[PDB]
UniProtKB/Swiss-Prot annotation:
GO BP annotations, alphabetical order: removal of superoxide radicals
Keyword terms: Cytoplasm, Heme, Iron, Metal-binding, Muscle protein, Oxidoreductase, Oxygen transport, Phosphoprotein, Transport
Residue list for modification Phosphothreonine: T67
EC number: 1.7.-.-, 1.11.1.-
Source organism phylogeny: Eukaryota, Metazoa, Chordata, Craniata, Vertebrata
Organism: Physeter macrocephalus
Catalytic reaction annotation: Fe(III)-heme b-[protein] + nitric oxide + H2O = Fe(II)-heme b-[protein] + nitrite + 2 H(+); H2O2 + AH2 = A + 2 H2O
Quaternary structure note: Monomeric.
Record localization: Cytoplasm, Sarcoplasm
Name by which UniProt lists this protein: Myoglobin
Enzyme class: oxidoreductase
Residues noted as binding heme b in the record, renumbered to the chain: H93
Amino acid sequence: VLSEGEWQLVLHVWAKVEADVAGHGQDIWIRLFKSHPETLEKFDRFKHLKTEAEMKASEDLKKHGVTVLTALGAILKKKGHHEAELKPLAQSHATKHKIPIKYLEFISEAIIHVLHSRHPGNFGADAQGAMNKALELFRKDIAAKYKELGYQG
Ligand code: HEM
């Protein structure tokens, strides 16, 4: 459970991300694909992208980034009361896409890295700790749902 103070640090930096959702989306996914090339294998629609240049020029990847960050933002804004939002997300990722928890750990790393690079003034040590906590909570709850749905993760 996060304190109100920790949620405030998370939503404060998220407000900055929302000024440019598409841009943040691209940076985060490209970071993920570059650092962990294996994750690209999960997208039959992006598995053909060979360079960062092709990734940055992909309209479909940009759209995916917006879809993902909008869903994550909705969850964070619930401040822990995200049961309803997580159910459909857990079902599609465990049953259809088959995304292991390890990959959610990788994207969490990418998110923290991008926020640190683009928002140093609003992402000091305390704020990073709060964001890490919020993302760990998200991963812990999705993991619990994965189990209930029959997917090891
Ligand atoms: C911050 C965590 C993430 C959030 C909130 C998120 C959210 C979403 C949403 C809302 C969709 C569209 C609806 C759906 O199919 O459920 C989606 C699709 C998908 N996600 Fe996730 N996702 C996350 C992380 C990941 C990761 C780490 C991977 C893979 C390494 C992944 C792979 C996919 C795939 C393969 C699709 C379908 C893409 C397509 O065929 O159009 N997701 N995700």
